[PDB]
C-alpha cells in the first residue's frame, strides 16, 4: 500500500543487517546486543514512531522475544543443524544439547529455520511477519488497541499483495507465512521460561537491556 509500503518494511530489515563456550551465555550476550538494534528496527517500521511512547514501550516489551527469534531463525537458513547469532558466532545442535537446552533448540530448527528454508522465505516476508508480531493489538495496556489493529491490517494486506505479485504460482504462500506465527509464539514462550531460569539461578551473565526486559511489567 501507500500507507504501509513493503519497500519501507524491507528497508527496515536491510538497515539492521549486522557487521566463553556456554552457548547460553553467547545467546544471552547476542540478545542484549540485538535489543538495541530491535529498537532501531521498530523506528523504521512505518507509523510505529507516531504511536505514543507508552504504546511503543508496550509493543516492544510484548514482542521482543518473538521478534529476535524470527530474526536469528531467518539468518540461520544457510546453516546446517545450527543457528547464526548477530555476533557472527554459530551455535551447533550438539552444543545446545550439551548445555541442557536441546529440546527448545530442536524446536527452533524444526518449526522455524527448516520451514523458512523449505519455502525460501525472503526478507520482505520476514519483515512483514515481524511487523505483524510488533503491531500486536492484544498487548495489555495499549491506549488505543484499534489503531494497532489497523496497523496490523495494513501490514498483512501489504504482505498478501507482495506474495501474490512475487509468488503467483504459490496461492497458499500468504497462509503458510501466517501459520508460522503460532509456532513462533509457542517457541517464544518456552525461550522466555529458559531466560527466567538462567536469571534465577545466576551463572549466566545477563547484560543491562536483557535484564531490564526480564524485570516485571
Amino acid at each position: 500500500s501507500m500507507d504501509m509500503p513493503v519497500e519501507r518494511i524491507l528497508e527496515a530489515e536491510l538497515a539492521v543487517e549486522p557487521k566463553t563456550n556456554d552457548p547460553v551465555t553467547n545467546i544471552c550476550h547476542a540478545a542484549d546486543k540485538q535489543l538495541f538494534t530491535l529498537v532501531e528496527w521498530a523506528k523504521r517500521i512505518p507509523h510505529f514512531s507516531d504511536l505514543t511512547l507508552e504504546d511503543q514501550v508496550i509493543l516492544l516489551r510484548a514482542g521482543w522475544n518473538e521478534l529476535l527469534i524470527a530474526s536469528f531463525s531467518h539468518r540461520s537458513v544457510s546453516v546446517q543443524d545450527g543457528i547464526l547469532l548477530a555476533t557472527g558466532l554459530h551455535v551447533h545442535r550438539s552444543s545446545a544439547h550439551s548445555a541442557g537446552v536441546g529440546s527448545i533448540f530442536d524446536r527452533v530448527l524444526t518449526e522455524l529455520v527448516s520451514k523458512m528454508k523449505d519455502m525460501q522465505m525472503d526478507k520482505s516476508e520476514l519483515g512483514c511477519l515481524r511487523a505483524i508480531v510488533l503491531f500486536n493489538p492484544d498487548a495489555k495496556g495499549l491506549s488505543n488497541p484499534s489503531e494497532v489493529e489497523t496497523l496490523r491490517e495494513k501490514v498483512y494486506a501489504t504482505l498478501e499483495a507482495y506474495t501474490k505479485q512475487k509468488y503467483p504460482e504459490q496461492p497458499g504462500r500468504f497462509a503458510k507465512l501466517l501459520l508460522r506465527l503460532p509456532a513462533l509464539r509457542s517457541i517464544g514462550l518456552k525461550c522466555l521460561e529458559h531466560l527466567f531460569f538462567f536469571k534465577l539461578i545466576g551463572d549466566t551473565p545477563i547484560d543491562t537491556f536483557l535484564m531490564e526486559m526480564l524485570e516485571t511489567p
Binding site: 516492544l60 537491556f209 531490564e212 526486559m213
Partner: peptide, 13 residues
Amino acid sequence: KHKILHRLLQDSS
C-alpha cells in the same frame, strides 16, 4: 522504569 527502552525510544537523533 524501563529506563533503557524509554531513553532509546525518546531519542530521535
